[PDB]
Amino acid sequence: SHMASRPILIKNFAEHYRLMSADSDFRFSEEFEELKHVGRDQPCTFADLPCNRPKNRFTNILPYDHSRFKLQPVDDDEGSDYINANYVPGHNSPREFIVTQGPLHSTRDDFWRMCWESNSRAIVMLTRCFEKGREKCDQYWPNDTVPVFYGDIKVQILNDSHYADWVMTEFMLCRGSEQRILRHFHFTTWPDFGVPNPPQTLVRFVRAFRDRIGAEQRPIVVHCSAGVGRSGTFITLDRILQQINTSDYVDIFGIVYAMRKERVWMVQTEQQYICIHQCLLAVLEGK
């Protein structure tokens, strides 16, 4: 049924791609345009509160109420429960991901509290802190081995591994004698404009991530800067790469539709929407 879904037979994907990208992406552009109002009629009440106003990077990027992540209230604070974040469905769970903005210095304590309260064991970062001299994300994690306290959460690097396009970091998370291990997967190679090119570098990261994390039962935290365009791209990519193992179909459109209902602008540009397709084509063609 084709209002909120366009499944494509994998064996036909290459032709679908060709048809969709023909004539300067006419069909791709048409298809993506269909998603523009999806979700946008939903209230963003708490995001709009005066006490939460300073907690959002962008006035136009706000978590829907029905979907937002709620921090535990702290005695006598308006909005101590608020963070710019939303549960977003994945391959394995309707609440598999929590997607959020790049924390501000103002909000990183909240960010870490969320990681802790969510019981997340994995963060995916799809931005550099600075791009073209603009700050897109606070440096919310230590730059060495000396543990740093963010609110009640103590964070400490156990080790890190650098790669061509990402840095992997293993944190010890401590909180009043309770101890966890969390992994941080940081794609550091996204270009200053456009999408990764060749797209294969992103596939490599998604593959490296999923291979390492496994069938995670707990929420995975995902962010770029606004936590919509790049975050939306990575998730869609991670789903469909799993999907092609157990199905004859892929529904990129249906996936993006569903994400939209849960967080604004999930895959944000038509260029990222076409990019997801290009990554998958690379996979189905043996790169």
UniProtKB/Swiss-Prot annotation:
Compartment list: Membrane
Family under the similarity heading: Belongs to the protein-tyrosine phosphatase family. Receptor class subfamily.
Binding positions for substrate per the UniProt entry: 192, 224-230, 268
Biological role stated in the UniProt entry: May have a role in axon outgrowth and guidance.
Residues of the full protein shown: 1250 to 1531 of 1990
Residue intervals of the Tyrosine-protein phosphatase domain: 28-283
Organism encoding this protein: Drosophila melanogaster (Fruit fly)
UniProt tissue specificity: In 9-12 hour embryos, expression is specifically seen in the anterior commissure and its junctions with the longitudinal tracts.
Official protein name in the record: Tyrosine-protein phosphatase 10D
Catalytic site positions: 224 (phosphocysteine intermediate)
Highest taxon of the lineage: Eukaryota
Miscellaneous comment: This protein is translated by readthrough of a stop codon. There is currently no sequence that provides the identity of residue 1632.
